[PDB]
Amino acid sequence: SIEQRSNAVSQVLLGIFSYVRWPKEPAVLQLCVVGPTEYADGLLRGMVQANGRRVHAERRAVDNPDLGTLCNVIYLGVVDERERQQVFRSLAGHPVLSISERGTECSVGSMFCLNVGGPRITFEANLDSIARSGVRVHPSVLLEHH
Amino acid sequence: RTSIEQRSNAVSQVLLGIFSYVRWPKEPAVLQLCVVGPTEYADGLLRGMVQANGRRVHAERRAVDNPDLGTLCNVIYLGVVDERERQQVFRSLAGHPVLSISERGTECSVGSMFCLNVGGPRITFEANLDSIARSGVRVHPSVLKLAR
């Protein structure tokens, strides 16, 4: 069930956000969905964190040069290697949480990579990406909220 | 700059355009459209559409490994699938009158009947003449001139 998985993806992302800190916390958390996705329809309706902060969601282009300043979070879909490189050049130097919908590979690119097929959603963490991202991640994430 | 919104609305309009040239052996009261696999430009169609004749187009996302795509869908809008998944989808559609359109790809000769090219100045599409010839849905030949 795609709608059911989409709802689980929303819940997992909210769980993850709760463990992440930005150097200057926004009043409104900006989420950008970038590239082809199956499970982002829930995200795109927008969400609210338990702490009361709204999550505003927009779909944006891979080649938008301002992803780094428009987004606090990027939910990255199924893009090719060149598109991936372009996205992360745009994010370089900006404090951006990155999560990929798929996780067949999680050694290049996103901080977390979801595995949405199967019984429950799981994820892999890319420690090198986390170290370079500019956001702070609580080890408790590395889903129950903080 | 690339506009995901403009491209998404353009895709919706192109799909409606293509539908206008197609007839099903038993015309459904509501055209059922299935969005299958990761997509970038389907957010608009997923809100639902209406043909010029008043028939509603209902859209739902369905799983690539859903065995019943053939009876659930009148139209499939196909996102990113690898060759093994692609074959699974079209095995599910075999024997059913289903119009297939792919969002993106390098080749339009296996699988989907129409292949969109959403990049560039305007949306264009290719027609897969072999898939079209094998399909149980009927495509009026005049659509093939709009193909580029």
CSV table of N, CA and C in Angstrom, one decimal, chain A residues 14-130:
chain,number,residue,atom,x,y,z
A,14,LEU,N,9.4,12.8,10.7
A,14,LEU,CA,9.1,13.6,11.9
A,14,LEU,C,9.9,13.1,13.1
A,15,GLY,N,10.0,11.7,13.2
A,15,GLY,CA,10.8,11.1,14.2
A,15,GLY,C,12.3,11.6,14.1
A,16,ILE,N,12.8,11.5,12.9
A,16,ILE,CA,14.2,11.9,12.7
A,16,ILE,C,14.4,13.4,13.0
A,17,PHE,N,13.5,14.3,12.5
A,17,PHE,CA,13.7,15.7,12.7
A,17,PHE,C,13.9,16.0,14.2
A,18,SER,N,13.2,15.3,15.0
A,18,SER,CA,13.2,15.5,16.4
A,18,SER,C,14.5,15.4,17.1
A,19,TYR,N,15.4,14.6,16.4
A,19,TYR,CA,16.8,14.4,16.9
A,19,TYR,C,17.8,15.3,16.2
A,20,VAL,N,17.4,16.2,15.4
A,20,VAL,CA,18.3,17.1,14.6
A,20,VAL,C,18.2,18.5,15.1
A,21,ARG,N,19.4,19.2,15.2
A,21,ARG,CA,19.4,20.6,15.6
A,21,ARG,C,20.1,21.4,14.5
A,22,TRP,N,19.5,22.6,14.2
A,22,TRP,CA,20.1,23.6,13.3
A,22,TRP,C,20.9,24.6,14.1
A,23,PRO,N,21.9,25.2,13.5
A,23,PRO,CA,22.7,26.2,14.3
A,23,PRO,C,21.9,27.4,14.7
A,24,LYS,N,21.0,27.9,13.7
A,24,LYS,CA,20.0,28.9,14.0
A,24,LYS,C,18.7,28.3,13.7
A,25,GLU,N,17.9,27.9,14.7
A,25,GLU,CA,16.7,27.2,14.5
A,25,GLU,C,15.6,28.1,13.8
A,26,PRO,N,15.1,27.6,12.7
A,26,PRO,CA,14.0,28.4,12.0
A,26,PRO,C,12.7,28.4,12.7
A,27,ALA,N,11.9,29.4,12.5
A,27,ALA,CA,10.6,29.5,13.0
A,27,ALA,C,9.7,28.5,12.3
A,28,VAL,N,9.9,28.3,11.0
A,28,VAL,CA,9.2,27.3,10.2
A,28,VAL,C,10.3,26.5,9.5
A,29,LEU,N,10.1,25.2,9.7
A,29,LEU,CA,11.1,24.2,9.1
A,29,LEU,C,10.7,24.0,7.6
A,30,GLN,N,11.7,24.3,6.7
A,30,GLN,CA,11.4,24.2,5.3
A,30,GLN,C,11.9,22.8,4.7
A,31,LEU,N,10.9,22.1,4.2
A,31,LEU,CA,11.3,20.8,3.6
A,31,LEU,C,11.1,20.9,2.1
A,32,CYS,N,12.1,20.4,1.4
A,32,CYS,CA,12.1,20.4,-0.1
A,32,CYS,C,12.2,18.9,-0.6
A,33,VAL,N,11.2,18.6,-1.4
A,33,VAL,CA,11.2,17.3,-2.1
A,33,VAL,C,11.9,17.4,-3.5
A,34,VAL,N,12.9,16.6,-3.7
A,34,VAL,CA,13.7,16.9,-5.0
A,34,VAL,C,13.9,15.6,-5.7
A,35,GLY,N,13.3,15.6,-7.0
A,35,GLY,CA,13.5,14.4,-7.8
A,35,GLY,C,12.3,13.4,-7.7
A,36,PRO,N,12.4,12.4,-8.5
A,36,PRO,CA,11.2,11.4,-8.5
A,36,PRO,C,11.1,10.7,-7.2
A,37,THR,N,9.9,10.6,-6.7
A,37,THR,CA,9.6,9.9,-5.4
A,37,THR,C,8.3,9.2,-5.5
A,38,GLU,N,8.2,8.2,-4.7
A,38,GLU,CA,6.9,7.4,-4.6
A,38,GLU,C,6.1,7.7,-3.3
A,39,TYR,N,6.9,8.2,-2.2
A,39,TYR,CA,6.3,8.2,-0.9
A,39,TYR,C,6.2,9.6,-0.3
A,40,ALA,N,6.3,10.6,-1.2
A,40,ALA,CA,6.4,12.0,-0.6
A,40,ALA,C,5.0,12.7,-0.6
A,41,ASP,N,3.9,12.1,-1.0
A,41,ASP,CA,2.6,12.8,-1.1
A,41,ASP,C,2.2,13.3,0.3
A,42,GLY,N,2.4,12.5,1.4
A,42,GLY,CA,2.1,13.0,2.7
A,42,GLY,C,3.0,14.1,3.1
A,43,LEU,N,4.3,14.0,2.9
A,43,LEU,CA,5.2,15.1,3.2
A,43,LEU,C,4.8,16.4,2.6
A,44,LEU,N,4.3,16.4,1.4
A,44,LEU,CA,4.0,17.5,0.6
A,44,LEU,C,2.8,18.3,1.0
A,45,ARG,N,2.0,17.6,1.9
A,45,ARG,CA,0.8,18.3,2.5
A,45,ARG,C,1.3,19.1,3.7
A,46,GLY,N,2.5,19.0,4.1
A,46,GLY,CA,3.0,19.7,5.2
A,46,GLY,C,2.7,19.0,6.5
A,47,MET,N,3.5,19.3,7.6
A,47,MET,CA,3.4,18.6,8.8
A,47,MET,C,3.6,19.6,10.0
A,48,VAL,N,3.4,19.1,11.2
A,48,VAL,CA,3.8,19.9,12.4
A,48,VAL,C,4.6,19.0,13.3
A,49,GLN,N,5.7,19.5,13.9
A,49,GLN,CA,6.4,18.8,14.9
A,49,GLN,C,5.7,18.8,16.2
A,50,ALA,N,6.0,17.9,17.1
A,50,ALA,CA,5.5,17.9,18.4
A,50,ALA,C,5.8,19.2,19.2
A,51,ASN,N,6.9,19.8,18.9
A,51,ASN,CA,7.3,21.1,19.6
A,51,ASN,C,6.5,22.3,19.1
A,52,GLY,N,5.6,22.0,18.1
A,52,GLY,CA,4.7,23.1,17.6
A,52,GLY,C,5.1,23.7,16.3
A,53,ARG,N,6.4,23.5,15.9
A,53,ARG,CA,6.9,24.1,14.7
A,53,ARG,C,6.3,23.5,13.5
A,54,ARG,N,5.8,24.4,12.6
A,54,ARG,CA,5.3,23.9,11.3
A,54,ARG,C,6.4,23.5,10.4
A,55,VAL,N,6.2,22.4,9.6
A,55,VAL,CA,7.1,22.0,8.5
A,55,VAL,C,6.4,22.3,7.2
A,56,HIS,N,7.0,23.3,6.5
A,56,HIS,CA,6.4,23.7,5.2
A,56,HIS,C,7.1,22.9,4.1
A,57,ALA,N,6.3,22.3,3.2
A,57,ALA,CA,6.9,21.4,2.2
A,57,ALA,C,6.7,21.9,0.8
A,58,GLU,N,7.7,21.9,0.0
A,58,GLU,CA,7.7,22.3,-1.5
A,58,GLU,C,8.4,21.3,-2.3
A,59,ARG,N,7.9,21.0,-3.5
A,59,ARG,CA,8.7,20.2,-4.5
A,59,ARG,C,9.6,21.2,-5.2
A,60,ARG,N,10.9,20.9,-5.3
A,60,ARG,CA,11.8,21.8,-6.0
A,60,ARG,C,12.7,21.1,-7.0
A,61,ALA,N,13.3,21.8,-7.9
A,61,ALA,CA,14.1,21.2,-9.0
A,61,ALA,C,15.5,20.8,-8.6
A,62,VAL,N,16.0,19.7,-9.1
A,62,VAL,CA,17.4,19.3,-8.9
A,62,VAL,C,18.4,20.4,-9.2
A,63,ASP,N,18.1,21.2,-10.2
A,63,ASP,CA,19.0,22.2,-10.7
A,63,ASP,C,18.7,23.6,-10.1
A,64,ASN,N,17.9,23.7,-9.1
A,64,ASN,CA,17.7,24.9,-8.4
A,64,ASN,C,18.9,25.2,-7.6
A,65,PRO,N,19.7,26.3,-8.0
A,65,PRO,CA,20.9,26.6,-7.4
A,65,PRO,C,20.8,27.1,-5.9
A,66,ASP,N,19.6,27.4,-5.5
A,66,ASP,CA,19.4,27.9,-4.2
A,66,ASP,C,18.8,26.9,-3.2
A,67,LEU,N,18.9,25.6,-3.5
A,67,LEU,CA,18.4,24.6,-2.5
A,67,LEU,C,18.9,24.8,-1.1
A,68,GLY,N,20.2,25.1,-1.1
A,68,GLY,CA,20.9,25.3,0.2
A,68,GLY,C,20.4,26.4,1.1
A,69,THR,N,19.8,27.4,0.5
A,69,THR,CA,19.2,28.5,1.3
A,69,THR,C,17.7,28.5,1.4
A,70,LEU,N,17.0,27.8,0.5
A,70,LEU,CA,15.6,27.6,0.5
A,70,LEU,C,15.1,26.5,1.5
A,71,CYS,N,15.9,25.5,1.7
A,71,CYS,CA,15.6,24.3,2.4
A,71,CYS,C,16.3,24.1,3.7
A,72,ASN,N,15.7,23.6,4.7
A,72,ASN,CA,16.3,23.1,6.0
A,72,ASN,C,16.5,21.6,5.8
A,73,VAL,N,15.6,21.0,5.1
A,73,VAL,CA,15.6,19.5,4.9
A,73,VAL,C,15.5,19.3,3.4
A,74,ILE,N,16.2,18.3,2.9
A,74,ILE,CA,15.9,17.8,1.5
A,74,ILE,C,15.6,16.4,1.6
A,75,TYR,N,14.4,16.0,0.9
A,75,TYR,CA,14.0,14.6,0.8
A,75,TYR,C,14.3,14.3,-0.7
A,76,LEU,N,15.3,13.5,-0.9
A,76,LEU,CA,15.9,13.3,-2.2
A,76,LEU,C,15.4,12.0,-2.9
A,77,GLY,N,14.8,12.2,-4.1
A,77,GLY,CA,14.3,11.0,-4.7
A,77,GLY,C,15.3,10.3,-5.6
A,78,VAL,N,14.8,9.5,-6.5
A,78,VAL,CA,15.6,8.7,-7.3
A,78,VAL,C,16.2,9.4,-8.5
A,79,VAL,N,17.4,10.0,-8.3
A,79,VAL,CA,18.0,10.8,-9.3
A,79,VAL,C,19.3,10.1,-9.7
A,80,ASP,N,19.8,10.4,-10.9
A,80,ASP,CA,21.1,9.8,-11.4
A,80,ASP,C,22.3,10.4,-10.7
A,81,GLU,N,23.5,9.9,-11.0
A,81,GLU,CA,24.7,10.3,-10.3
A,81,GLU,C,25.0,11.8,-10.5
A,82,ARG,N,24.8,12.2,-11.7
A,82,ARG,CA,25.1,13.6,-12.0
A,82,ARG,C,24.1,14.6,-11.3
A,83,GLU,N,22.8,14.2,-11.2
A,83,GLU,CA,21.8,15.0,-10.5
A,83,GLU,C,22.2,15.0,-9.1
A,84,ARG,N,22.6,13.9,-8.5
A,84,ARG,CA,23.0,13.8,-7.1
A,84,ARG,C,24.2,14.7,-6.8
A,85,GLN,N,25.2,14.7,-7.7
A,85,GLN,CA,26.3,15.6,-7.5
A,85,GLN,C,25.9,17.1,-7.5
A,86,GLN,N,25.0,17.4,-8.4
A,86,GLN,CA,24.5,18.8,-8.6
A,86,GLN,C,23.8,19.3,-7.3
A,87,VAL,N,22.9,18.4,-6.8
A,87,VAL,CA,22.2,18.7,-5.5
A,87,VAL,C,23.2,19.0,-4.4
A,88,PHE,N,24.1,18.1,-4.2
A,88,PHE,CA,25.0,18.3,-3.0
A,88,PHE,C,26.0,19.4,-3.2
A,89,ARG,N,26.4,19.8,-4.4
A,89,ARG,CA,27.2,21.0,-4.6
A,89,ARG,C,26.4,22.2,-4.1
A,90,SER,N,25.1,22.2,-4.4
A,90,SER,CA,24.2,23.3,-4.0
A,90,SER,C,24.1,23.3,-2.4
A,91,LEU,N,24.1,22.2,-1.8
A,91,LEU,CA,23.9,22.2,-0.3
A,91,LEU,C,25.2,22.5,0.4
A,92,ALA,N,26.4,22.3,-0.2
A,92,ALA,CA,27.7,22.4,0.4
A,92,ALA,C,27.8,23.8,1.1
A,93,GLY,N,28.2,23.7,2.4
A,93,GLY,CA,28.3,25.0,3.2
A,93,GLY,C,27.1,25.5,3.9
A,94,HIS,N,25.9,24.8,3.6
A,94,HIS,CA,24.7,25.2,4.3
A,94,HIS,C,24.2,24.1,5.2
A,95,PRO,N,23.6,24.5,6.3
A,95,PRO,CA,23.1,23.5,7.3
A,95,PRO,C,21.8,22.8,6.9
A,96,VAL,N,21.9,21.7,6.1
A,96,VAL,CA,20.8,21.0,5.5
A,96,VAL,C,20.8,19.5,5.9
A,97,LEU,N,19.6,19.1,6.4
A,97,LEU,CA,19.4,17.7,6.7
A,97,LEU,C,19.0,17.0,5.4
A,98,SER,N,19.7,16.0,5.0
A,98,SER,CA,19.3,15.3,3.8
A,98,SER,C,18.9,13.8,4.0
A,99,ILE,N,17.8,13.4,3.4
A,99,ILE,CA,17.3,12.1,3.6
A,99,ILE,C,16.9,11.6,2.2
A,100,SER,N,17.4,10.4,1.8
A,100,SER,CA,17.0,9.8,0.5
A,100,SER,C,15.9,8.8,0.6
A,101,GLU,N,15.0,8.7,-0.3
A,101,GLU,CA,13.9,7.8,-0.3
A,101,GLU,C,14.4,6.3,-0.4
A,102,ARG,N,15.4,6.1,-1.2
A,102,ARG,CA,16.0,4.8,-1.3
A,102,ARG,C,17.4,4.7,-0.7
A,103,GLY,N,17.8,3.4,-0.4
A,103,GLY,CA,19.0,3.2,0.3
A,103,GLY,C,19.7,2.0,-0.2
A,104,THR,N,19.9,1.9,-1.5
A,104,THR,CA,20.6,0.8,-2.1
A,104,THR,C,22.1,1.2,-2.0
A,105,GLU,N,22.3,2.5,-1.8
A,105,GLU,CA,23.7,3.0,-1.6
A,105,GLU,C,23.6,4.1,-0.7
A,106,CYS,N,24.4,4.2,0.3
A,106,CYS,CA,24.4,5.3,1.3
A,106,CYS,C,25.8,5.6,1.8
A,107,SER,N,26.7,5.8,0.9
A,107,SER,CA,28.1,6.1,1.2
A,107,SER,C,28.4,7.4,0.4
A,108,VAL,N,27.5,7.7,-0.5
A,108,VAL,CA,27.7,9.0,-1.2
A,108,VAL,C,26.3,9.7,-1.0
A,109,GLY,N,26.3,11.0,-0.8
A,109,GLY,CA,25.1,11.8,-0.8
A,109,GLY,C,24.4,12.0,0.5
A,110,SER,N,23.2,11.5,0.7
A,110,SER,CA,22.4,11.8,1.9
A,110,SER,C,22.9,11.3,3.2
A,111,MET,N,22.5,12.1,4.3
A,111,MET,CA,22.8,11.7,5.7
A,111,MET,C,22.2,10.4,6.1
A,112,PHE,N,20.9,10.3,5.7
A,112,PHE,CA,20.1,9.1,6.0
A,112,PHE,C,19.5,8.6,4.7
A,113,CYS,N,19.5,7.3,4.6
A,113,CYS,CA,18.8,6.7,3.4
A,113,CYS,C,17.8,5.7,3.8
A,114,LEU,N,16.5,5.9,3.5
A,114,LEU,CA,15.4,5.0,3.9
A,114,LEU,C,15.4,3.7,3.1
A,115,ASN,N,14.9,2.7,3.7
A,115,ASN,CA,14.5,1.5,3.1
A,115,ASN,C,13.1,1.2,3.3
A,116,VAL,N,12.2,1.6,2.4
A,116,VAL,CA,10.8,1.6,2.6
A,116,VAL,C,10.1,0.3,2.3
A,117,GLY,N,10.6,-0.5,1.5
A,117,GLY,CA,10.1,-1.8,1.2
A,117,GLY,C,10.2,-2.6,2.5
A,118,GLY,N,9.5,-3.7,2.6
A,118,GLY,CA,9.6,-4.6,3.8
A,118,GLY,C,8.6,-4.3,4.9
A,119,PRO,N,8.7,-5.0,6.0
A,119,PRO,CA,7.8,-5.0,7.1
A,119,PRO,C,7.6,-3.6,7.8
A,120,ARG,N,8.7,-3.0,8.1
A,120,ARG,CA,8.8,-1.7,8.7
A,120,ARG,C,9.8,-0.9,8.0
A,121,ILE,N,9.7,0.4,8.0
A,121,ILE,CA,10.8,1.3,7.4
A,121,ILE,C,12.0,1.3,8.3
A,122,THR,N,13.2,1.1,7.6
A,122,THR,CA,14.5,1.2,8.3
A,122,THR,C,15.3,2.3,7.6
A,123,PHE,N,16.5,2.6,8.1
A,123,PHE,CA,17.3,3.6,7.4
A,123,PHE,C,18.8,3.4,7.8
A,124,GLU,N,19.7,3.7,6.8
A,124,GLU,CA,21.1,3.7,7.0
A,124,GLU,C,21.6,5.2,7.2
A,125,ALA,N,22.7,5.3,8.0
A,125,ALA,CA,23.3,6.6,8.2
A,125,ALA,C,24.6,6.7,7.5
A,126,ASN,N,24.9,7.8,6.9
A,126,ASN,CA,26.2,8.1,6.3
A,126,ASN,C,26.9,9.1,7.2
A,127,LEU,N,27.9,8.6,7.9
A,127,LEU,CA,28.5,9.4,9.0
A,127,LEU,C,29.4,10.5,8.3
A,128,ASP,N,29.9,10.2,7.2
A,128,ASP,CA,30.7,11.3,6.5
A,128,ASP,C,29.8,12.4,6.1
A,129,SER,N,28.7,12.1,5.6
A,129,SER,CA,27.7,13.1,5.2
A,129,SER,C,27.2,13.9,6.4
A,130,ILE,N,26.9,13.2,7.5
A,130,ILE,CA,26.5,13.9,8.7
A,130,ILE,C,27.6,14.8,9.2
